Amino acid sequence: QLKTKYNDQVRPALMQQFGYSSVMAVPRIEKIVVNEGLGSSKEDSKAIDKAAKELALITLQKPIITKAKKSISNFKLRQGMPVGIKVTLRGERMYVFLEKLINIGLPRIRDFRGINPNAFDGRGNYNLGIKEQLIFPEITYDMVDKTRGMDITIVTTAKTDEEARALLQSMGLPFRK
Amino acid sequence: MELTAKPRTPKQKLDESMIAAVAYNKENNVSFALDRKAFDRAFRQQSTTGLFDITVEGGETFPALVKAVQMDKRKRAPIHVDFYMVTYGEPVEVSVPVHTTGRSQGEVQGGLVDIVVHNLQIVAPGPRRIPQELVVDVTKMNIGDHITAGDIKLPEGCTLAADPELTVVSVLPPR
Amino acid sequence: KRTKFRKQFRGRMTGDAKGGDYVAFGDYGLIAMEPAWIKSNQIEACRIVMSRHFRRGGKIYIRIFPDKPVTKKPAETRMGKGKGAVEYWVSVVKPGRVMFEVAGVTEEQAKEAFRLAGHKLPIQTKMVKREVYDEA
Amino acid sequence: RRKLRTRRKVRTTTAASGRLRLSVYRSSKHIYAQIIDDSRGQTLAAASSAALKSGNKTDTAAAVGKALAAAAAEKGIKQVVFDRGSYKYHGRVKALADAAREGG
RNA sequence: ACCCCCGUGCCCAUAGCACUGUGGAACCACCCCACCCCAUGCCGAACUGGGUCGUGAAACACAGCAGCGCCAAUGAUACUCGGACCGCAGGGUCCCGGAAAAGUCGGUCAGCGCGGGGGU
Ligand SMILES: [Mg+2]
Ligand SMILES: [Mg+2]
Ligand SMILES: [Mg+2]
Ligand SMILES: [Mg+2]
Ligand SMILES: [Mg+2]
Ligand SMILES: [Mg+2]
Ligand SMILES: [Mg+2]
Ligand SMILES: [Mg+2]
Ligand SMILES: [Mg+2]
Ligand SMILES: [Mg+2]
Ligand SMILES: [Mg+2]
Ligand SMILES: [Mg+2]
Ligand SMILES: [Mg+2]
Ligand SMILES: [Mg+2]
Ligand SMILES: [Mg+2]
The answer, for C56 touching chain B at a CB cutoff of 8 Å, is: yes
Count of CA atoms in the C-beta half-sphere (13 A) of D64: 34
> How is the beta sheet containing D35-37 ordered, strand by strand?
D21-22, D35-37, D42-43
Find the C15 Cα to ligand 2 centroid distance in Å.
Answer: 6
Through-space separation of residue B31 CA and nucleotide E95 C1' in angstroms: 25
Is residue D43's beta carbon less than 7 angstroms from any atom in nucleic acid strand E? yes
What CA–CA distance (Å, rounded) separates C85 from C7?
Answer: 11
| Burial of A132 from C-beta contacts in 10 A (0-12 / 13-18 / 19+) | middle
Q: Give which of B45, B172, B174 is closest to B115, Cα–Cα.
A: B172
Chain C contact set for B82 (CB, 8 A):
none
Stretch 82-101 of chain C: residues touching chain B, C-beta under 8 Å: 94-96
Q: Which of C46, C47, C44, C56 is nearest to C1 (CA)?
A: C44
> Any idea which nucleotide's C1' is nearest the CA of D44?
E115
DSSP string, A47-110: HHHHHHHHHHHHHSSPPB--B-----BTTB--SSSB---BEEE-THHHHHHHHHIIIIITTS-S
The answer to whether D68 CB is within 7 Å of strand E is no
Cα separation, C38 vs B136, in Å, equals 39
Identify which of B43, B95, B114 has the shortest CB distance to residue C59: B114
Strand E near-CB residues (< 7 Å), C 5-24? 13-16
Strand order in the sheet with A152-155: A87-89, A31-34, A152-155, A127-128
Please report, as a single letter, which amino acid is at residue C63.
Answer: R
Q: How far is the CA of C18 from the C1' of E78 (A)?
A: 10
Q: Could you give the CA distance from residue B59 to residue B31 in angstroms, rounded to a whole number?
A: 16
Interval between CA A30 and ligand 7 midpoint (Å): 10
Identify nearest nucleotide to residue B6 by CA to C1′ distance: E75
- Rounded Cα distance between B103 and C68, Å, is 44
Task: Note whether A128 and A97 are within 8 A (CB).
Answer: no
Q: Which of D24, D12, D6 is nearest to D98 (CA)?
A: D24
Provide the chain C residues 59-78 that lie in CB contact (below 8 A) with chain B. 59
DSSP string, D53-97: --SSHHHHHHHHHHHHHHHHHTTT---B-----S--S-HHHHHHH
Of A89, A85, A118, which is closest to residue A101 (Cα–Cα)?
Answer: A89
Residue B22 CB in 7 A reach of strand E: yes
CB pairs under 8 A between B and C: 43
Nearest of D81, D84, D100 to residue D39 by alpha carbon? D81
Rounded CA separation B22/B32 (Å): 5
The whole-angstrom distance between B69's CA and the closest CA on chain C is 8
Smallest CA–CA distance from B81 into chain C, residue: C134
> For the packed helices C41-54 and C107-118, what is the interaxial angle rounded to 10 degrees?
150
Nearest-by-CA chain B residue for C54: B175
CA of D6 to C1' of E96 (A): 56
Least CB–CB distance from C132: residue in B47, B73, B175: B47
Nucleotide nearest the Cα atom of B67 (by C1'): E104
In terms of Cβ atoms closer than 10 Å to its own Cβ (0-12, 13-18, 19+), residue C97 is buried
The answer to whether the beta carbons of residues C36 and C115 sit under 8 Å apart is: no
The C-alpha atoms of residue B168 and residue B120 are separated, in whole angstroms, by 8
Among chain A residues 30-89, those with CB within 7 Å of any atom of strand E = 31, 61-65, 67, 86-89
For residue B122, list its beta bridge partners.
B94, B160
- Residue D27: which nucleotide is closest by CA–C1'? E28
CB contact under 8 A, C56 and B47: no
- DSSP at C98: B
Amino acid at D92: R
Task: Provide the domain limits for residue A28.
Answer: 1-177
Q: How far is ligand 14, taken at its centre, from the CA of residue B154, in Å?
A: 37
Q: Which nucleotides of E are covered by protein (CB under 7 A)?
A: 6-10, 27-31, 34, 37-38, 41-52, 54-58, 73-79, 90-92, 95-96, 103-107, 113-118
Q: Which nucleotide is nearest to D83 (CA to C1')?
A: E8
Identity at B49, one-letter amino acid code: T
How many domains, in total, are found in chain A?
1
CA dist C101 → A128, C91, C133, D32 (Å)? 60, 17, 15, 75
Structural domains of chain C sorted by starting position, each given as residue range(s) with its CATH number in brackets: 18-136 (3.90.1170.10)
Q: Would you say C61 and C31 are in contact if contact means Cβ atoms under 8 Å apart? A: no
Using CB atoms, pick whichever of C24, C59, C134 lies closest to residue B69.
C134
Chains sharing 3 or more CB pairs under 8 A with chain C: B
Among the partner residues C16, C18, C24, nearest to B74 by beta-carbon distance: C16
- Method by which the coordinates were obtained: X-ray
* Sequence-separated (6 or more) residues with CB below 8 Å from residue D80: D19, D20, D21, D22, D35, D72
The three-state secondary structure class of C51 is helix
Q: Is residue D65 packed enough to be buried (19+ CB in 10 Å), middle (13-18) or exposed (0-12)? A: buried
Pair D30, D60: CB distance under 8 Å: no
Please list, in sequence order, all residues whose beta carbon lies within 8 angstroms of the beta carbon of residue D33, skipping any fewer than 6 positions away: D22, D23, D24, D25, D46, D47, D48, D64, D65, D68, D96, D100
Q: Give domain limits for chain B.
A: 1-86, 87-175
DSSP state of A24: G
Residue of C51, C132, C135 to mutate, testing the B interface (most B Cβ within 10 Å of its Cβ): C132
Interchain pair C56, B95: CB under 8 A: no
